[PDB]
Design a protein around this motif. Structure first.
Motif, PDB file in Angstrom:
ATOM      1  N   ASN A   1       8.837   9.356   0.080  1.00 26.25           N
ATOM      2  CA  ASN A   1       8.730   9.107  -1.484  1.00 26.25           C
ATOM      3  C   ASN A   1      10.306   8.230  -2.141  1.00 26.25           C
ATOM      4  O   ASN A   1       9.504   7.665  -3.170  1.00 26.25           O
ATOM      5  CB  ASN A   1       8.816  10.229  -2.045  1.00 26.25           C
TER       6      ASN A   1
ATOM      7  N   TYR B   1       9.694   4.540  -1.493  1.00 29.38           N
ATOM      8  CA  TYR B   1       8.692   3.615  -2.581  1.00 29.38           C
ATOM      9  C   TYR B   1       9.192   4.240  -4.056  1.00 29.38           C
ATOM     10  O   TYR B   1       9.031   2.730  -4.486  1.00 29.38           O
ATOM     11  CB  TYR B   1       7.599   5.351  -2.771  1.00 29.38           C
TER      12      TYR B   1
ATOM     13  N   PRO C   1       0.827  -1.186  -0.343  1.00 28.09           N
ATOM     14  CA  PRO C   1      -0.043   0.069   0.422  1.00 28.09           C
ATOM     15  C   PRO C   1       0.836   1.027  -0.039  1.00 28.09           C
ATOM     16  O   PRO C   1       2.334   1.446   1.709  1.00 28.09           O
ATOM     17  CB  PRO C   1      -0.728  -0.132   1.469  1.00 28.09           C
ATOM     18  N   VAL C   2       0.119   2.141  -0.451  1.00 27.84           N
ATOM     19  CA  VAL C   2       1.112   3.668  -0.609  1.00 27.84           C
ATOM     20  C   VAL C   2       0.174   4.610  -0.003  1.00 27.84           C
ATOM     21  O   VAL C   2      -1.206   5.006   0.055  1.00 27.84           O
ATOM     22  CB  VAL C   2       1.426   4.434  -2.278  1.00 27.84           C
ATOM     23  N   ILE C   3       1.327   5.142   0.552  1.00 34.29           N
ATOM     24  CA  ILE C   3       0.341   6.171   1.217  1.00 34.29           C
ATOM     25  C   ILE C   3      -0.152   7.726   0.822  1.00 34.29           C
ATOM     26  O   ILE C   3       0.951   7.984   0.311  1.00 34.29           O
ATOM     27  CB  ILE C   3       1.274   6.582   2.664  1.00 34.29           C
ATOM     28  N   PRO C   4      -0.839   8.119   1.321  1.00 29.49           N
ATOM     29  CA  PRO C   4      -1.450   9.133   0.292  1.00 29.49           C
ATOM     30  C   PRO C   4      -0.438  10.535   0.122  1.00 29.49           C
ATOM     31  O   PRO C   4       0.565  10.260   1.239  1.00 29.49           O
ATOM     32  CB  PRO C   4      -2.611   9.866   0.990  1.00 29.49           C
ATOM     33  N   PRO C   5       0.310  10.904  -0.717  1.00 33.36           N
ATOM     34  CA  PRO C   5       1.111  12.045  -0.972  1.00 33.36           C
ATOM     35  C   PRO C   5       0.977  13.207  -0.281  1.00 33.36           C
ATOM     36  O   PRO C   5       2.290  13.579   0.769  1.00 33.36           O
ATOM     37  CB  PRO C   5       0.816  12.644  -2.434  1.00 33.36           C
ATOM     38  N   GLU C   6       0.336  14.166   0.686  1.00 34.92           N
ATOM     39  CA  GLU C   6      -0.211  14.666   1.528  1.00 34.92           C
ATOM     40  C   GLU C   6       1.010  14.688   3.262  1.00 34.92           C
ATOM     41  O   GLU C   6       1.520  15.200   3.613  1.00 34.92           O
ATOM     42  CB  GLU C   6      -1.411  15.412   2.027  1.00 34.92           C
ATOM     43  N   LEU C   7       0.701  12.858   2.800  1.00 31.58           N
ATOM     44  CA  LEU C   7       2.056  12.967   4.030  1.00 31.58           C
ATOM     45  C   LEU C   7       2.925  12.329   3.924  1.00 31.58           C
ATOM     46  O   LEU C   7       3.660  12.496   4.674  1.00 31.58           O
ATOM     47  CB  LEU C   7       0.705  11.401   5.055  1.00 31.58           C
ATOM     48  N   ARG C   8       3.204  12.282   2.749  1.00 29.96           N
ATOM     49  CA  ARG C   8       4.687  12.266   2.439  1.00 29.96           C
ATOM     50  C   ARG C   8       4.662  13.412   1.578  1.00 29.96           C
ATOM     51  O   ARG C   8       5.648  13.467   0.479  1.00 29.96           O
ATOM     52  CB  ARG C   8       5.288  10.812   1.732  1.00 29.96           C
TER      53      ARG C   8
END
Ligand SMILES: [Mg+2]
Ligand SMILES: [Zn+2]
Ligand SMILES: [Zn+2]
Lengths: 93, 1092, 426, 293, 94
Positions: free
Chosen positions: D49, D52, D26-33
């Motif tokens: 980032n 990933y 699973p890839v975490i939302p961009p706002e959290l990275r």
DNA sequence: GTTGTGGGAGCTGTCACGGATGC
DNA sequence: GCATCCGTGAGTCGAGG
RNA sequence: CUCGA
């Protein structure tokens, strides 16, 4: 971790800055000047200027939602824009 | 009787009783001489001829010799570098500061290429890069900011033996470690993180005969190393041989140190394999315990465990050597590509320029000066800041130990630090014990060992022949003390003398057993520490604090030298490099607030530009003023202009204040301080603070920002101080909130509010749709606009990518002393100002003279810093002047020291050196013969006290109070900088919590311990509110603001965004977390008001 | 260590060069030592907070008749004042009516035992008392007000919503930076680690036999009940023998052939608290631990009231270890709460466990994850498909709900308030 | 027993052990990275980032290798690299050498975001930064009442800013609410009077670190003071371990009614004279007072 | 409403991981260096994660609150508040 | 499309503890 | 049968650049 | 990174 310095320094050049609870809550409040300038026009021509300028509907959809022909819708548009520019010209600045 | 060497230096009478047999060396030499070695200047040539062998080689010459020659594997071609030369400097220092450049000089070398089979030898002059340069003051300019390269403490190469105790039966177990100039190390034969290594499985002996080892021949010890350290590959007969031959015998891989080789050959033998044999014999015969050891060919080595903190085994790498090592890295990274290009291309068509890529050397130098922990933002609150910063020694950084792997024994004052690293000046906080400062007279030597000077003693006769000894050489001798009785001709009067021996212990030895003597007391001190009057009367905690706080004084608009100081103020100010000094004796031909021109005697003209209202790295104001008049004849070295914290050439970090020591109505309770309002009306503690606001217009997604005076719906009156460009006008007074540089940022159409949408539609507005991103002045700040600098992409001004314009507003403010400001004496006696009283209710003497500062009595005795009291007494003496009655002889109390101190005019400048100078009896004597005031009234009695009136009621205070004159500094900790509040501001895009820091208008952190406290009270609702609607509830907080504005009750709180973020992080960890109802499935997380 | 040459100067005469030099050693060493001591005190306070924060008052009185006896005096032909009445007797609530032999009832059960009460008890000749503590409190979840007694701050009876646990953690940690055998020993106790110098104890009453050897101390107890003889291993001569063998005998060092009771220390030093747990019982382990901890804080001038250390100690014994699952699904050798083990009922024996381990073994996986060892906690929670009831106050803090303490209690937060009729009239 | 605990958990939980192996990450939302650009056109991103990106690059390379039917050893190398990169993405450093960015900094893996004093739990859940808060250096105010404290004017104006805007619109100093805000921001003289009205009986909390016991946070009634420094009653110093050698303290403004009530009743300085640990009195004459008496 | 009863964990099956996701990222590209715009199917792709700007799609044919929740067909980016960018997870197929 | 010679920086002055692992 | 090797703890809150 | 309590 990107730092608060970096976040604020980025907001210094962004389209929208890091907004405050104050800014949000006040934005939620009504602009008395323009609200008064709108309340002056007949609610029909003003409903038209709304469906046409604020919301940006196409004139055909404005005629639909108004239950009126297209000519009446666009004439109300012209008249109301003229009126509100009259009352809101000194206000706009 | 001090400062006679410096021409024009004022006459500060000194209580000292010992002759100074050696002046202070160049207090910046630690930096300069290092860099001059690195470069190979004629200065260093002569300095090495005077105290060095005939064959000198600078840092770059050494790097080149080591690198030469770059050779082909077949030996078919060879490249050789030589003769490092520098051009002139690219841009001056002030220019580099202004343009954000790097003061540097082009580096050139002669590159000779040879093809062994064509004989072709094409020599060439190749350019290596813009080598950054050290300034006169001993700093560097990188990206327009001034930086210092702090010397680093590290273990010099060599072998070291220690004695541990085993957990079996407390048996004495020896161990050894070999630290190399370059490469890997080993221990006892465990090597490179591979234990279980028998010492006899790789080659009278007590345990050497006991080695347990089962093998014969040389292939067993050759294969075991490849099977025990080179895994992931089968056991071979050739690869192990190759690795063993390239491990320590090979010089490319294993770099045998020069300092390291010297130390090791001094430990084993005058003249590798010999070393390993000697080391095995050493470990063996140390497990035994014999005094000496005899090795084949070598002799006379004591079998002893080595101390890891001793300054004979602990060196420092000055700026020159750090730079040299970074250059060596760049040079090897270049040599790689040099050989890799020699391979491919054809010979006789490759010139030195074709196969020499300097990009790695440039990148190495750049990375060093820009990321190293030892290239530090120059602490320049005031001259003393920078002077100590340059002379500083830290043990952290790349190559040393870790701030967490450094225990407590590292931070302990070692006896070998005497005269090398001052034991007082060190930080109070986490870095304590790790950052020291070089002792006054100390001096680094070619090998990185700190030497110190001693007077030679011949047959109990103190000579004038000085000699510099390192920690080792010193340990091997007996050093007398500086305050040792000596008759003229250099003869100890007492039958014996107190001395120091190698064990770090003291003794009382007959005079004929002394070898060397201290050059002067305070030889162990640093510059800052050496400036604390009556140091010996202060405990080390408060003295350390006094040094650290001297390094924090802020420059005042007008500087006033201390009425009572050490002898160090003058020399400190001069060496610091913030005063203008006459490079060549002449006659002042012209003087202005702007420059000073001196006509030398040989017709030469030299001119000096005065730094006028310069902002320093920390906001203090660097402002020079000339102290010469037209037609004045100035000698070489004479001080021409005063710097920020200097007065007539002496460090003036504070002011002389009239102090009364007595509790006054609690307003000086618990270390607070009470100030006379005079210090405001007369600007006695006023300082200038210059901040630099910056703003750039750059390229955005929706277009490019524009710096414009035309800002959306702003009152014409608000812009009244902006020029046509939208930049504030010079000399404009800016309050907090005013505009400094107008700027608009392209806004998208989706962001236009409904109100703005209708406004731009009806009135037929244009399609600009920008946002006001103008640069405003931050909270709690104000002042006159000193200056404006501007850089345009249109013009040939170099800026980063996508950055069109960039303007900088320099704003100055005059800060008067105020409640909250932090003052302190030189004795670690700090305090914030509790109240500034009107002059009328300040306690005052008989003649109506109101005191200036009231220092609470309760603070003196427990801090063990009565130094301040002695200083107060001597300061009153100096403020009133005195006359010891000589008729009928010189009293016994004034017989010993006083020579020209028998009398002194009012406001006399006196110096009491540390560990010498003013003696208690002499202090009391002077206190007896104070001169009277205008009306012939003696105001301060022989105890140093005086009656005082209560400026409030009128009645006198019942008992005499100690009044005097004390030197008080304004430390750079001011309310104006530390006050901060926030109702609502920017939040973090990640945690959605308020930003942190005043600069970002942040919020206070309610930490875990604070939540503990809150819970202990049982304030459930307060804790919830603090943690939900003040921090994270993105809708709750706007609701709360809306409710406060409309006089409605505060709503119920929602859900912290940080919790949602925690859930998202868990999920990203493949953990299926879920929120559930009482009896239900997972709850999920994620118009009418606008139309109204 | 100390330097064989002292600083003969006063800081008034001014120190000689070498005197100042040598004195800097002490100055700087002490500064760094305080730097470290503050962090150690902080970590201990944090662990206390964690192991104890779920301990709130919930009932006014459990009505239990258990308690602890506190010495109030010692008699010598006039009576001394009990050495530390200030921390163990004062501010308690009296469990059983204290009457003077041949005298009136001087103090009633359930009283505050303030200064006047202690003074009256002492004047009447009351040499000791029996008070109620949280150690012997009978409430299930937390402690009852009366077992806890006076609130040290308010001086009155603790209110029903206090978070006495956090207040105890604080009262114990705040003076931490005064501990200069020290703070290490306080941690050795609170964590329940088998002490460094282990002083064995008698396992049962009987007759003792000593055996001397070259650094070899060999002890053997012949039980009075006739059971097998208890042999204790040899001990190095570093451990001198305990100094009470007095059962109508030598009130001096332990000599061979003395009568030893069950809970008697055999040689000087510190004793393993688990051994005393299994030999003398849990209510004795609590007493011993409280006293031992208090010893350190007393040897430094720190008056911490015993009730705080008791609030901490209580949370070290709340669980038992199951030898044989028996009729229950509880795995053996697993730490299970005492009530979770009593209701279900099963070879469950008391067990002592340190504050860190006790904390990591809580019913709220969120709490554990946020306290320490996040990785392991989360992995085990994922495997065991754990579910957090969201009932601890730290959990509610994390989720933004009113903490269940003080004003967060249900009776307090849902109070209804309407003006009376008589006031609504005027 | 050990090897049974885990098997029994997997049995009774309904969690098929198959989970322990992943076929999709699973890839975490961009706002959290997040990603930003700093002064200089350069960009800064979260370590995430980069981890990933490495995982995705190696996955695409494995796909391209499987398609090109390359040697089994090459594909095995690519698979090992993929496993190692996902291990880094999850708990970098746990196995092998940690993945380093520029400067050999071990990248902050996904596990780092939960661990430590500066991880998610201890740093953002058990304590956060709040609004209506401020800081400043403290100085002794002897003329104070034990239940009083002195706030710099500017501090109080900023803290109660919404309250003062409300009372500025109540009175007719400001036309609308936007104008009330602009007025309070310009510091127009009308505000000051109004300020002293809003602050009437409105408690505020003062805290000094380190907060060792609850008395490290105490409530006070604030009165406006001349200057930019907080005035602190001397008797309370003992509780805060506060001396005036330069320390500062933080101010928090309770907003809700329950918050103000907790401040008045629970945390009021006057109500906390005694040491919650010993019962002795703390708000007691300490040095000067003592000598005086 | 901050009145949950319990909070539960469990190892996520790839089925759960894909049910969560809004689309699989495929490329290392993050944003177009020139236009400062998220490269499609990258770690910042708006097609799966969300729109950078409120009610604005990728290509731009749809930018107004008039049609909320519309799923653009040219670039396949839902027209909603960018807040979802903090709550929309992606996934990678190993 | 790649066809002459080919092992890198990093610790690296911490301590005290408890329990899998691994020979 | 346990001895090592590893992996986890090691104070809070503040300011710059 | 250095510094303040
Ligand atoms: Mg303080
Ligand atoms: Zn009870
Ligand atoms: Zn589209």
């Amino acid at each position: 971790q990107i730092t608060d310095w970096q976040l604020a320094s980025n907001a210094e050049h962004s389209s929208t800055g890091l907004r405050s609870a104050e800014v949000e809550a006040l934005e939620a409040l009504p602009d008395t000047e323009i609200k008064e300038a709108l309340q002056a026009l007949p609610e029909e021509f003003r409903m038209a200027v709304y469906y046409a300028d604020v919301e940006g509907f196409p004139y055909k959809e404005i005629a639909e939602i108004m239950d009126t022909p297209i000519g009446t819708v666009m004439s109300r548009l012209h008249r109301g824009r003229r009126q509100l520019r009259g009352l809101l010209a000194d206000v706009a600045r | 009787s001090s400062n006679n060497s410096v021409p024009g230096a004022p006459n500060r009478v000194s209580f000292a009783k010992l002759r100074e047999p050696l002046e202070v060396p160049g207090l910046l030499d630690v930096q300069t001489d290092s860099f001059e070695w690195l470069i190979g200047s004629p200065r260093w040539r002569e300095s090495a001829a005077e105290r060095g062998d005939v064959n000198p080689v600078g840092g770059l010459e050494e790097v080149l010799y080591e690198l030469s020659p770059i050779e082909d594997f077949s030996g078919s071609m060879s490249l050789s570098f030589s003769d490092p030369r520098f051009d002139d400097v690219k841009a001056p220092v002030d220019e580099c500061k202004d343009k954000d450049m790097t003061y540097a000089a082009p580096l050139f070398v002669t590159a000779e290429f040879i093809n062994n089979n064509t004989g072709e030898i094409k020599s060439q002059t190749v350019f290596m890069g813009d080598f950054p340069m050290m300034t006169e003051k001993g700093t560097f300019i990188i990206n327009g900011t001034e930086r210092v390269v702090v010397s680093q403490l590290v273990r010099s190469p060599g072998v070291y033996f220690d004695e541990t105790i085993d957990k079996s039966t407390d048996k004495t177990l020896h161990s050894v470690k070999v630290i190399p100039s370059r490469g890997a190390w080993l221990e006892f034969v465990r090597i490179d993180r591979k234990r279980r290594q028998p010492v006899t499985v790789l080659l009278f002996s007590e345990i050497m005969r006991s080695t347990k080892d089962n093998t014969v021949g040389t292939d067993e010890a050759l294969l075991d190393i490849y099977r025990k350290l080179r895994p992931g590959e089968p056991p071979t007969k050739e690869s192990a041989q190759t690795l063993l031959e390239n491990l320590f015998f090979k010089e490319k891989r294993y770099d045998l140190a020069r300092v390291g080789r010297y130390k090791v050959n001094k430990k084993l033998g005058l003249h590798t394999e010999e070393d390993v044999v000697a080391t095995i014999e050493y470990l063996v015969r140390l497990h035994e315990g014999q005094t000496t050891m005899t090795v084949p060919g070598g002799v006379e080595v004591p079998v002893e465990t080595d101390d890891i903190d001793h300054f004979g085994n602990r060196r420092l790498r000055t700026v020159g050597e750090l730079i040299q090592n970074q250059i060596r890295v760049g040079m090897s990274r270049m040599e790689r590509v040099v050989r890799e290009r020699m391979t491919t291309q054809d010979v006789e068509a490759i010139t030195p320029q074709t196969l020499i890529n300097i990009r790695p050397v440039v990148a190495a130098i750049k990375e060093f000066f820009g990321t190293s922990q030892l290239s530090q933002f120059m602490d320049q609150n005031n001259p003393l800041s920078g002077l100590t910063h340059k002379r500083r020694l830290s043990a952290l950084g790349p190559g040393g130990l870790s701030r967490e792997r450094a225990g407590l024994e590292v931070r302990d004052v070692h006896p070998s630090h005497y005269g090398r690293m001052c034991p007082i000046e060190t930080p109070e906080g986490p870095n304590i014990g790790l950052i020291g400062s070089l002792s006054v007279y100390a001096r680094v030597n070619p090998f990185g060992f700190i030497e110190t000077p001693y007077r030679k003693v011949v047959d109990g006769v103190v000579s004038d022949e000085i000699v510099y000894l390192t920690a080792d050489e010193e340990d091997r001798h007996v050093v007398a003390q500086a305050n040792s009785p000596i008759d003229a001709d250099g003869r100890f009067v007492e039958p014996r003398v107190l001395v120091r021996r190698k064990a770090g212990e003291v003794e009382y030895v007959p005079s004929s057993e002394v070898d060397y003597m201290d050059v002067s007391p305070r030889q162990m001190v640093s510059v800052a520490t050496a400036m604390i009057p009556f140091l010996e009367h202060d405990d080390a905690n408060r003295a350390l604090m006094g040094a650290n706080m001297q390094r924090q004084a802020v420059p005042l608009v007008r500087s006033e030298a201390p009425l009572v100081g050490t002898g160090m103020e003058l020399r400190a100010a001069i060496d610091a490099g913030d005063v203008v000094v006459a490079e060549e004796s002449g006659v002042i031909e012209e003087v202005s607030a702007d420059y000073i021109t001196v006509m030398h005697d040989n017709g030469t003209r030299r001119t000096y530009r005065m730094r006028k209202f310069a902002r320093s790295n920390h906001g203090t104001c660097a402002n020079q003023c000339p102290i010469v008049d037209a037609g004045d004849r100035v000698e070489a070295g004479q001080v021409i202009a005063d710097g920020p914290c200097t007065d007539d050439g002496e460090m003036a970090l504070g002011k002389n204040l009239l102090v009364a020591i007595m509790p006054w109505e609690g307003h000086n309770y618990e270390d607070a301080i009470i100030l006379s309002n005079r210090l405001v009306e007369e600007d006695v503690l006023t300082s200038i603070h210059i901040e630099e606001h910056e703003i750039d217009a750059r390229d955005t997604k929706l277009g490019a920002e524009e710096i414009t005076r035309d800002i959306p719906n702003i009152s014409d009156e608000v812009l009244a101080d902006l020029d046509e460009r939208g930049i504030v006008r010079i000399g404009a007074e800016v309050r907090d909130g005013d505009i400094l540089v107008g700027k608009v940022t392209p806004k998208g159409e989706t962001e236009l509010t409904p109100e703005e949408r209708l406004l731009r539609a009806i009135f037929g507005e244009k399609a600009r749709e920008v946002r006001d991103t103008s640069l405003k002045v931050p909270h709690g700040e104000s002042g006159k606009v000193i200056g404006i600098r501007v850089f345009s992409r249109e013009d040939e001004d170099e800026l980063p990518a996508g950055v069109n314009e960039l303007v900088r507003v320099y704003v100055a403010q005059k800060r008067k002393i105020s409640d909250g400001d932090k003052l302190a004496g030189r004795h670690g006696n700090k305090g914030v100002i509790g109240k500034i009283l009107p002059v009328e209710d300040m306690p005052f003497l008989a003649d109506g003279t109101p005191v200036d500062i009231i220092l609470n009595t309760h603070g003196v005795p427990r801090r063990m810093n009565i130094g301040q009291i002695l200083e107060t007494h001597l300061g009153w003496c100096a403020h009133s002047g005195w006359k010891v009655d000589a008729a009928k002889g010189v009293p016994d109390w004034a017989a010993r020291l006083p020579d020209e101190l028998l009398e002194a005019q009012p406001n006399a400048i006196v110096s009491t050196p540390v560990f010498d100078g003013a003696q208690e009896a002499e202090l009391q004597g002077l206190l007896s013969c104070t001169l009277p005031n205008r009306d012939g009234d003696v105001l301060v009695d022989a105890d140093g006290k005086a009656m005082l009136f209560d400026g409030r009621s009128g009645e006198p205070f019942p008992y005499p109070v100690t009044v005097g004159y004390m030197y008080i500094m304004k430390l750079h900790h001011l309310v104006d900088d530390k006050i901060h509040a926030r109702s609502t501001g920017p939040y973090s895009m990640i945690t959605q919590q308020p930003l942190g820091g005043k600069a970002q208008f942040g919020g206070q952190r309610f930490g875990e311990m604070e939540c503990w406290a809150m819970q202990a009270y049982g304030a459930a609702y307060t804790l919830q509110e603090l943690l939900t609607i003040k921090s994270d509830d993105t809708v709750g907080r706007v609701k709360v603001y809306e409710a406060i504005v409309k006089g409605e009750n505060i709503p119920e709180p929602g859900i912290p965004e940080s919790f949602k973020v925690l859930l998202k992080e868990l999920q990203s960890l493949c953990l299926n977390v879920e929120v559930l109802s009482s009896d239900g499935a997972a709850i999920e997380l994620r118009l009418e008001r606008a139309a109204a | 260590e100390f330097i064989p040459r002292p600083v003969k100067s006063s800081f008034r005469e001014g120190l000689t060069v070498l005197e100042y030099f040598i004195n800097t050693h002490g100055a700087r060493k002490g500064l760094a030592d305080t730097a470290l001591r503050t962090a150690d005190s902080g970590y201990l306070t944090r662990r206390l907070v964690d192991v104890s924060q779920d301990v709130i008052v919930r009932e006014h009185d459990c009505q239990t008749e258990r308690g602890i006896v506190v010495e109030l005096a010692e008699r010598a032909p006039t009576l001394i004042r009990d050495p530390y009445i200030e921390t163990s007797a004062y501010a308690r609530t009296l469990g059983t009516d204290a009457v003077d032999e041949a005298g009136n009832v001087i103090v009633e059960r359930g009283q505050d035992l303030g200064d006047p009460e202690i003074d009256a008890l002492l004047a009447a000749g009351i040499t000791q008392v029996k008070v109620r503590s949280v150690l012997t409190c009978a409430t299930s979840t937390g402690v009852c007000a009366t077992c806890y007694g006076r609130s040290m701050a308010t001086g009155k009876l603790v209110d029903i919503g206090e978070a006495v646990g956090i207040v105890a953690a604080q009262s114990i940690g705040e003076p931490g930076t005064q501990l200069t055998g020290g703070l290490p020993r306080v941690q050795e106790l609170f964590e329940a680690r088998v002490p460094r110098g282990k002083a064995p104890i008698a396992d049962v009453t009987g007759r003792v036999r000593l055996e001397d050897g070259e650094r070899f101390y060999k002890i053997t107890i012949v039980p009075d009940d006739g059971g097998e003889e208890v042999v204790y291993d040899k001990i190095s001569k570093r451990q001198r023998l305990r100094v009470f063998k007095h059962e109508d005998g030598s009130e001096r060092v332990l000599s061979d052939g003395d009568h030893v009771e069950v809970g008697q220390q055999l040689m000087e030093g510190s004793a393993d608290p688990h051994e005393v747990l299994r030999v003398q019982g849990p209510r004795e382990v609590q007493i011993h631990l409280v006293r031992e901890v208090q010893e350190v804080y007393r040897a430094q001038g720190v008056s911490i009231h015993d009730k705080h250390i008791e609030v901490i100690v209580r949370q070290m014994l709340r669980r038992v270890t199951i030898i044989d699952s028996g009729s229950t699904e509880f795995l053996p050798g697993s730490l299970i709460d005492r009530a979770e083990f009593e209701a279900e009922n099963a070879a469950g024996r008391p067990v002592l466990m340190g504050i860190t381990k006790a904390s990591l073994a809580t019913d709220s996986w969120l709490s554990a994850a946020s306290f320490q060892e996040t990785t392991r906690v989360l992995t085990d929670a994922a495997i065991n498909c754990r579910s957090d009831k969201l009932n601890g106050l730290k959990e509610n803090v994390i989720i933004g709900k009113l903490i269940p303490a003080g004003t967060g209690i249900n009776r307090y937060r849902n109070i209804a308030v309407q003006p009376t009729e008589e006031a609504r009239a005027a | 027993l050990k090897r049974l605990k885990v098997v029994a958990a997997f049995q009774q939980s309904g969690n098929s052990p198959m989970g322990m192996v992943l076929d999709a990450v699973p890839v975490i939302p961009p706002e959290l990275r997040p990603m930003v650009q700093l002064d200089g056109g350069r960009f800064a991103t979260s370590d995430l980032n980069d981890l990933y990106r490495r995982v995705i690059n190696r996955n695409n390379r494995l796909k391209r290798l499987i398609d090109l039917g390359a040697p089994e050893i090459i594909v095995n190398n690519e698979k090992r690299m993929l496993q190692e990169s996902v291990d880094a993405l999850f708990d970098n450093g746990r196995r092998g050498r940690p993945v380093t960015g520029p400067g050999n900094r071990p990248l902050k893996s996904l596990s780092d975001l939960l661990k430590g004093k500066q991880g998610r739990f201890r740093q953002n859940l058990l304590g956060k930064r709040v609004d209506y808060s401020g800081r400043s250096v403290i100085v002794v105010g002897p003329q104070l009442k034990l239940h009083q404290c002195g706030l710099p004017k500017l501090m109080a104006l900023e803290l109660f800013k919404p309250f003062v805007m409300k009372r500025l619109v109540d009175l007719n100093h400001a036309q609308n609410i936007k104008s009330a805000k602009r007025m309070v921001e310009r510091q127009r003289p009308q505000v000051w009077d109004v300020l002293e009205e809003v602050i009437a009986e409105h408690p505020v909390l003062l805290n000094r670190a380190p907060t060792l016991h609850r008395l490290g946070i105490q409530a006070f009634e604030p009165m406006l003071v001349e200057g930019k420094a907080i005035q602190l009653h001397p008797l309370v110093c003992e509780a805060f371990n506060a001396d005036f050698d330069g320390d500062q303290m933080a101010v928090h403004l309770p907003l809700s009614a329950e918050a103000q009530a907790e401040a008045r009743i629970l945390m009021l300085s006057s109500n906390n004279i005694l040491s919650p640990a010993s019962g002795r009195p703390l708000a007691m004459p300490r040095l000067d007072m003592v000598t005086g008496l | 409403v901050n009145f949950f009863d319990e909070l539960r964990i469990g190892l996520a099956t790839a089925e759960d991981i894909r049910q969560w996701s809004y689309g699989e990222v495929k490329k290392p590209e993050t944003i177009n260096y020139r236009t400062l715009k998220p490269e499609k199917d990258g770690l910042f792709c708006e097609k799966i994660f969300g729109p950078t700007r409120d009610w604005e799609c990728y290509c731009g044919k749809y930018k107004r609150v008039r049609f909320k929740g519309i799923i653009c067909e040219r670039c396949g980016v839902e027209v909603t508040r960018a807040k979802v960018r903090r709550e929309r997870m992606g996934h990678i197929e190993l």
